[PDB]
Design an enzyme around this catalytic site. Structure first.
Site, short mmCIF file in Angstrom:
data_model
loop_
_atom_site.label_atom_id
_atom_site.label_comp_id
_atom_site.label_asym_id
_atom_site.label_seq_id
_atom_site.Cartn_x
_atom_site.Cartn_y
_atom_site.Cartn_z
N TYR A 167 0.81 -1.21 0.00
CA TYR A 167 0.00 0.00 0.00
C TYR A 167 0.86 1.27 0.00
O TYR A 167 0.54 2.23 -0.69
CB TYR A 167 -0.92 0.02 1.22
CG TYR A 167 -1.53 1.37 1.48
CD1 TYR A 167 -2.57 1.86 0.69
CD2 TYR A 167 -1.08 2.17 2.53
CE1 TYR A 167 -3.15 3.11 0.94
CE2 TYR A 167 -1.64 3.41 2.79
CZ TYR A 167 -2.67 3.88 1.99
OH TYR A 167 -3.23 5.10 2.25
N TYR A 168 1.93 1.28 0.78
CA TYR A 168 2.80 2.45 0.84
C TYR A 168 3.89 2.45 -0.21
O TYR A 168 4.48 3.50 -0.47
CB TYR A 168 3.48 2.57 2.23
CG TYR A 168 2.55 2.88 3.39
CD1 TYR A 168 2.11 1.87 4.24
CD2 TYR A 168 2.09 4.18 3.62
CE1 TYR A 168 1.22 2.14 5.28
CE2 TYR A 168 1.20 4.46 4.66
CZ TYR A 168 0.77 3.44 5.48
OH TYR A 168 -0.14 3.71 6.48
MG MG Z 1 -0.88 8.51 -0.23
#
Ligand code: MG
Length: 275
Positions: free
Chosen positions: A16-17
């Site tokens: 996600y990051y």
């Molecule tokens: Mg962001």
């Protein structure tokens, strides 16, 4: 400003990051470890997705383990996401106007605010039946730069991921508290949300103005923009997204290059001005 949110599950957190699609326009994710704690674990520079995920689970690189397996799931809170967003004009001038030293300015502002956040690090420790929070001063952080908002508009930001760990007298303990009570770390970060935002916001303005650009206050808490920048025109293949942004930028008539030469001349003008 600075928004606060629970960090996203140790499971999907990593991708996600870090998946390339969050920093495509920027080019690189400019990700890095931060905090006295990361240094203590020998975590410096580029961030390993696997070490990061583990960190979110409580498994530290020095053997320490704060994980709590219970009926199939870890009950150790992963941590927090402190997101620093730059003002719209800066995002545009940086990734649409190609002025990369604004990315640096931003990075410098985040480092600055995050260092202040760290002074709030603490943990619960009870002695003599009385429990109280004890300042700890060290955090383990992983920062990641993204360039796109929720509604697909340019937004330079850094997700400062704070692992739920801190060292106390040599022991790695939790920032979170399994008991409501005497104000902890994140509660203190909320009580100061505007202030950390103002810190970041004001540090960026110094850098930005140093490069020659102008700024004007447009809202509460010193919220500012760069005069003349078409902020209004900006409120999945990133390559296409960029294409559109660049197009809608042209339709505004704004002259990027002219805007920057103006910032260069203003800057030099100030360095060569004793009277
Ligand atoms: Mg962001």
């Amino acid at each position: 400003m600075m928004s606060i949110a629970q960090v996203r599950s140790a499971g999907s957190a990593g991708n996600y990051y870090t998946d390339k699609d969050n920093y495509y326009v920027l080019g690189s994710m400019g990700e890095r470890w931060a905090g006295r704690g990361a240094e203590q674990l020998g975590l410096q520079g580029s961030v390993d997705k696997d070490v990061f995920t583990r960190l979110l689970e409580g498994r530290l690189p020095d053997g320490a383990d704060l994980s709590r397996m219970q009926d199939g799931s870890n009950r150790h809170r992963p941590g927090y996401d402190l997101t620093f967003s730059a003002p719209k004009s800066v995002s545009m001038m940086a990734m649409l106007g190609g002025d990369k030293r604004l990315i640096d300015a931003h990075n410098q502002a985040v480092d600055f605010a995050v260092r202040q956040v760290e002074a709030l690090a603490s943990t619960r420790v009870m002695t003599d039946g009385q429990s109280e929070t004890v300042l700890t001063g060290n955090l383990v952080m992983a920062l990641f730069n993204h360039d796109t908002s929720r509604d697909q508009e340019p937004q330079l930001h850094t997700h400062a991921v704070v692992a739920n760990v801190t060292q106390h007298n040599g022991e790695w303990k939790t920032l979170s508290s399994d008991k409501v009570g005497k104000t902890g770390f994140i509660e203190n970060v909320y009580a100061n949300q505007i202030a950390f935002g103002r810190l970041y916001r004001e540090k960026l303005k110094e850098q930005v103005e140093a490069l020659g650009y102008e700024t004007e206050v447009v809202g509460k808490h010193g919220m500012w923009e760069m005069p003349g920048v078409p902020v209004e025109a900006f409120s999945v293949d990133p390559e296409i997204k960029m294409a559109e942004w660049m197009q809608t930028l042209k339709e505004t008539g704004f002259d990027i290059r002219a805007y920057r030469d103006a910032a260069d001349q203003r800057a030099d003008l100030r360095t060569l001005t004793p009277g």
